Amino acid sequence: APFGTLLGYAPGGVAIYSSDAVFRSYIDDEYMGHKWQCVEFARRFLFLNYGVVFTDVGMAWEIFSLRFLREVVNDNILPLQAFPNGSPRAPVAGALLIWDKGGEFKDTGHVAIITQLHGNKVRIAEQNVIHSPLPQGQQWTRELEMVVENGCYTLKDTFDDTTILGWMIQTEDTEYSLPQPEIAGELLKISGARLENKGQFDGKWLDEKDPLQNAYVQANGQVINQDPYHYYTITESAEQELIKATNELHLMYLHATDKVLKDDNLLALFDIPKILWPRLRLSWQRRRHHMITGRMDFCMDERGLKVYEYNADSASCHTEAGLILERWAEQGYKGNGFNPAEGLINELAGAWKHSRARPFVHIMQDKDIEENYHAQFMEQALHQAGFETRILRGLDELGWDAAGQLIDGEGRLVNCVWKTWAWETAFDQIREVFAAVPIRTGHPQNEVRLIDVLLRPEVLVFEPLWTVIPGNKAILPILWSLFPHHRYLLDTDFTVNDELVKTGYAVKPIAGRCGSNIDLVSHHEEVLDKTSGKFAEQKNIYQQLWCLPKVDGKYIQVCTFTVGGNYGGTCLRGDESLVIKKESDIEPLIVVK
Amino acid sequence: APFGTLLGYAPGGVAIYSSDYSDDAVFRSYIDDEYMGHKWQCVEFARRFLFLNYGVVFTDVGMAWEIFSLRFLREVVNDNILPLQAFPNGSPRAPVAGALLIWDKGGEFKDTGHVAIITQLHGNKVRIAEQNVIHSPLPQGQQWTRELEMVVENGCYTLKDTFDDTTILGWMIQTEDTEYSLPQPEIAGELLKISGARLENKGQFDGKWLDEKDPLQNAYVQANGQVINQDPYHYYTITESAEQELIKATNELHLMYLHATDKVLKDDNLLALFDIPKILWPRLRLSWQRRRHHMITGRMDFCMDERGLKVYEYNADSASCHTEAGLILERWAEQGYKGNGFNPAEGLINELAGAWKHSRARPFVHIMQDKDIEENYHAQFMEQALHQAGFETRILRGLDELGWDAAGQLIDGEGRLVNCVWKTWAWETAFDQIREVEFAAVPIRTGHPQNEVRLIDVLLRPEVLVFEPLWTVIPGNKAILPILWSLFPHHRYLLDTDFTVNDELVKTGYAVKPIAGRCGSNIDLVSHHEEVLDKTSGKFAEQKNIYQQLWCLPKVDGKYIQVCTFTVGGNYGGTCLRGDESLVIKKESDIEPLIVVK
Ligand SMILES: Nc1ncnc2c1ncn2[C@@H]1O[C@H](COP(=O)(O)OP(=O)(O)O)[C@@H](O)[C@H]1O
Ligand SMILES: Nc1ncnc2c1ncn2[C@@H]1O[C@H](COP(=O)(O)OP(=O)(O)O)[C@@H](O)[C@H]1O
Ligand SMILES: [Mg+2]
Ligand SMILES: [Mg+2]
Ligand SMILES: [Mg+2]
Ligand SMILES: [Mg+2]
């Protein structure tokens, strides 16, 4: 049958169809996958029958490496175990069956659902294998022979050149299960590289015909770093580890956020004005799927991969990674590798298209040359997604009508805004000074403040208010508490405890940014580095010391973007010091296989 | 200014609109799925202000003055229930910013009373915000509508209204601190007495008093004849104050039931008590999450008389009696009643049409009923509400007309796809089909030789949007009673219920009731003297039981009379009476004319 024709149904009545964002398959606002791939079927099956889902993956074979499932109704996280083909642990109905990449399933690998177990066979349901209508009421696509001998179960596939990895069961019983796959240190090494110097960057290599690249130059000049002929590389294996961690930590952060918002004692730790709490909760409940983009900061090298923080509120660097660096490669890279942030623009337009933003969105940026290209970069994504826009620089163009409605300069109503401003800046206006958030709805001089916009109930804001929770460092000790000793986490606390004193630690303000007010204390007493900034008075958290690697004279940090909650790209930042700050450079990154 | 024009904003940016009135569905005001009130009344503003700024709301009330008797607020984000205290005007407890301020009915606020929000305290005064008082644009930026003088005399605070003929009851603060607060009012027993009454016999009902040209009434007659009870000239009455109490109880218990439902669906230990097939658990939860606001109607069963008001159960899944109370009794009144009272269920059909209009049912609704003539008029009554709301429908009697296409889609007789279903069947009947049969999913068919479609093949098809939603089996299962008792111990309207006969129950006597039964089946009433007062047979003798504190119906004019109230969209939608010669009301008990009298 053609594309999308109904071929049959798997148990419980889950359709099986024959097999850029018109291909997204959703149930309510829960993403199932890309029509009509094998993963989309497996996730939809689990969603409709058991209310759980597995995290976004690039290819089906990667599913076998996952060790958790997300229970959609409460954002809970469940254990998922993996068993190798030939296991004493029988493959029960409902289990995920995973194929490694290879043969019939060349680069992708494959995934199916086991529907029934017999004595010498098993029936499974799947998408993207069978493309013809199944017979009346038959709720399985293929039967695979099973050999039970000496208590061990082995499945034999119908293709002569495939490799079945095993099956996965949602259970706490670890017996017979395999440990989580850990990447070998060496594949995570960041290494330096050089371009042949033929003078590719000895002039105006950035196109001043492009308004966007022009805005960048006006704020930075024709420069990315101290030596544009030098770049770094990472293995494709490393990129996949980054993608995995990004997708997992994002879910881990959302789970801790839910926990925080369900408990006043945990919420009090964030130092957000109490008058906002009910609103934080409302935002969490109704804008849960509305986060557009964020950035995670990681330390990556032979030692493994650890997250320092997650900039979920107002993340930048997009332009540099998804545009300036594309121009850089285009201008001087003749290699086989690729810029892992190449599709950022498109990914973002995708998020905006499936968001519930109003047709016209006002973009709010500070009157600051550096913010001009960021605001215009997002405007291009909004335009590609079909929205009309207007850029507000500063707050002077804003005023109120007689009734107290918000209007812009051309006289239109402002009811939807994407901002570059951090929510914390608005919280400051509350703390400077009631039965409600004290916002003005009229002024003799028509003086509109930041909070008078962002907290007007009728204004639809992006990023949503709840994002101040995962973007506040007070969440780190909570994440450590919920997932103690997790491979990607660093032990962090609200005090310098016994183990921390033993490991050395970083002191970081909970609502800071740009590498401000950071103190790095070695496992001795010595202060490795300390920075200044305006956040020295806020509460701090203490995070296990885990210093950036030094490669070719610079400390290099890896950053990944989330867009709509999934990996959207990678970029590097480098600094002469251990602490990355707003003025650290963007370093060209090439992923090589 | 005109009706609906923005006059300004209260603190936090909550708009205040003009309510000058010079399908009322356009009149309902929501924020997302939350009902705030009627545009643009004082109650609508109060609730919208509390929802927007604090994420809480108070239940539906008939009049504003009634808010003062409330003792809880609902937290929207988790269906949690918060304590609310009332303080009289002149109390030591000061009227803080954010507090509700209630006026009794009287003077400028005639019979509705009034409600406002206190926005700020000034030692000698207080500013407040409200909606149905001033209808003109407020000064630019001013976020309050009126100032009231406040006098502070010896630790106490008293407010004086700007009108000379009004009465301020006091203010309410969401706190667990009870100091200085009022005890929740309780109605006087005598006011809850149900009285017998009689019409003059002039032959009004001696012939064909039900109009047989009206399909609905005709369908009623084909099942029951031109009869409602044994003596159509006799009726019962209750006071307007007893009805206000029923309205109040109904709204409160519905939320208590939804709160217990949430708690059950969060804990596997509690859910296992319901004896529902494990394979459905994930679905039950999905339903509660997605269909939270889609319940259309339910019926609560109460014992009411001078001892008070107690609830026996809540038929949340498949309830009937709508046709009787809202149509047949309307015809009865029109035909023989010439007094000043009214049928408390007279607006049922309109209430129902409104719920459907705001539901998210698909454009075409298939009505599924069993082949019982008694179910014909019930299916047709609901079809009338559906039609009134703009939906197209087709009634399916039994499952014979159903079949699947080549791939396995569900179609009706005329071949149209079955997408939306309002059923008359109980969910437990489908649950039984599962019990009859380890699968990896609900074992439904999507193809068969004979094209034999079972009930579950329709109701548990993912693509079929069914009403009532699946989650309603929880509040309709009597396993929820001990849970509810556990959550609200000694609550005013609740009866002590357990899964065993405990010490307190032996002392009071108790009713033994199957958790998934209906219609008075397999009920055992046992006295404190340890004597069986009554037993009914039936088909549910094998399931788990709950034991509920004995509280027998009152006997009035020869019959035990039970009070039932309908819920429509989560709020009170009417009241009706059922009477029997025995203590246990059954499917065959009759409907008794009821008139609310002022
Ligand atoms: N635990 C840590 N160990 C070593 N260096 C750290 C640690 N945490 C942070 N740093 C350094 O400080 C910089 C700032 O910390 P980060 O958590 O990203 O906060 P922000 O960038 O919001 O100020 C990092 O980019 C890194 O160079
Ligand atoms: N605790 C109780 N004390 C006295 N009578 C009761 C009690 N519970 C139920 N009954 C009687 O039994 C009838 C049936 O019980 P009910 O709870 O309504 O279950 P159902 O109608 O679903 O079978 C009631 O209408 C009432 O007459
Ligand atoms: Mg950082
Ligand atoms: Mg940061
Ligand atoms: Mg009953
Ligand atoms: Mg019942």
Question: Can you describe what's shown?
Answer:
The structure is a homodimer. By secondary structure, chain A is of the alpha+beta class. In chain A, 22% of the residues lie in helices and 28% in strands. Chain A is built from 12 helices and 34 strands. In chain A, the strands form 9 sheets. Chain A has a 7-stranded antiparallel beta sheet, covered by helices on one side. In chain A, strands 17, 18, 30, 31, 32 and 33 form a 6-stranded antiparallel beta sheet that branches. In chain A, strands 25-29-26-27-28 form a 5-stranded antiparallel beta sheet. Chains A and B meet through strand 1, helix 1, strand 10 and helix 5 of A and strand 1, helix 1, strand 10 and helix 5 of B. The structure holds adenosine-5'-diphosphate (ADP) (2 copies) and magnesium ion (4 copies).
